[PDB]
Design a protein around this ligand. Structure first.
Ligand SMILES: Cn1nnc2cc(CO)ccc21
Length: 118
């Protein structure tokens, strides 16, 4: 029933994600010199460095808010890819499966802790 425990659990999951080779295209903002049409397709850019900095600044109130931004990384890859067989999109699907498998207990424990508090 620790209402604060999610934050260190999200720090440790981001460290696992940074060690995975599948995260490399997603660690920093998409390079607009490499992809000059990116902002004609994608309204809200997001990357794992941005998510870690927001967490470390004390600018997430809950793990649900962190989860919305990580899901935006994956939806941006699905919207920008020219093919469902592309290399980088293929990497996004494996990393999304890994993230969802690990975030589920973080979300459940936080929501349970908050119900006990209230
Ligand atoms: C950043 N991102 N996410 N998905 C992408 C797909 C491509 C091309 O297959 C290029 C860049 C991508």
């Amino acid at each position: 029933y620790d209402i604060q425990a999610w934050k260190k659990q999200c720090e440790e999951l981001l460290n696992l994600i940074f060690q995975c080779e599948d995260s490399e295209p997603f660690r920093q903002p998409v390079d607009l010199l490499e992809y000059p049409d990116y902002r004609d397709i994608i309204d809200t850019p997001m990357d794992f460095a941005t998510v870690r900095e927001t967490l470390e600044a004390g600018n997430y109130e809950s793990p649900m808010e962190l989860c919305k931004d990580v899901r935006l990384i994956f939806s941006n890859s699905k919207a920008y890819t020219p093919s469902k067989r592309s290399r980088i999109y293929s990497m996004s699907l494996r990393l999304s499966a890994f993230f969802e498998e690990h975030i589920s207990s973080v979300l459940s424990d936080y929501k349970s802790a908050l119900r006990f508090h209230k």
